[PDB]
Amino acid sequence: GSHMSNISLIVGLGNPGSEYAQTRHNAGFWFVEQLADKYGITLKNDPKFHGISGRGNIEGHDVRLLLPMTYMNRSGQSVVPFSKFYQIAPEAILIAHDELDMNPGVIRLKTGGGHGGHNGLRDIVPHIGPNFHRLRIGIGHPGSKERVSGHVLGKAPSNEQSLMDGAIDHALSKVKLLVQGQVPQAMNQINAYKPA
Numbered sequence: 001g002s003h004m005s006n007i008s009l010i011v012g013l014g015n016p017g018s019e020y021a022q023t024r025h026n027a028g029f030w031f032v033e034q035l036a037d038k039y040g041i042t043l044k045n046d047p048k049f050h051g052i053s054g055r056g057n058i059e060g061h062d063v064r065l066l067l068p069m070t071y072m073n074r075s076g077q078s079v080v081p082f083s084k085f086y087q088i089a090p091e092a093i094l095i096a097h098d099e100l101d102m103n104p105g106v107i108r109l110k111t112g113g114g115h116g117g118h119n120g121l122r123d124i125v126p127h128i129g130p131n132f133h134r135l136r137i138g139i140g141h142p143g144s145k146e147r148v149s150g151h152v153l154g155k156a157p158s159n160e161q162s163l164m165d166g167a168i169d170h171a172l173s174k175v176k177l178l179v180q181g182q183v184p185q186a187m188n189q190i191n192a193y194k195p196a
């Protein structure tokens, strides 16, 4: 199983299909795919867990990566059985996701708390509880409740995409702290990021 708050499962939330790959609601996929490339973790088809998953070494630690292929609002139908089968406690899970309540170029590491209206997190918290870690990738304010769908399923303009990409790059540099269980120092170093 997992060991204490050494992160050993990193989930990226998003929707499958080329038509969703560049949308804001796939920010978690972007992070996890970049992380996988950084450390040479193969992301391969995982039909038993309704996902694409990988396993490999990050900085001396055995870590699994998971992209649910369920569609966003059914993400728990991948995350929950995956984490149960491998006996990964929530305290050893990091879930990367788009955050409507933060600006593009803002990124934060959070432990615990609610879904904040996120329809992927809403499918996960009921089953494993709230005590997993989150990489909240700011995607900006949607401007109204009605324009939320159009915002998260939007492809960001290049300025906003640059701001998100720089924040995600910063977070990739701090995963070494997370897999080593240095969650407080990672929180300090991630949350301090500024784009300019």
Ligand SMILES: [Cl-]
Binding pocket: 015, 025, 072, 073, 119
């Ligand atoms: Cl969705």
Ligand SMILES: [Cl-]
Binding pocket: 108, 109, 110, 136
């Ligand atoms: Cl936060």
Ligand SMILES: [Cl-]
Binding pocket: 110, 113, 114, 115, 116, 134, 136
């Ligand atoms: Cl969160």
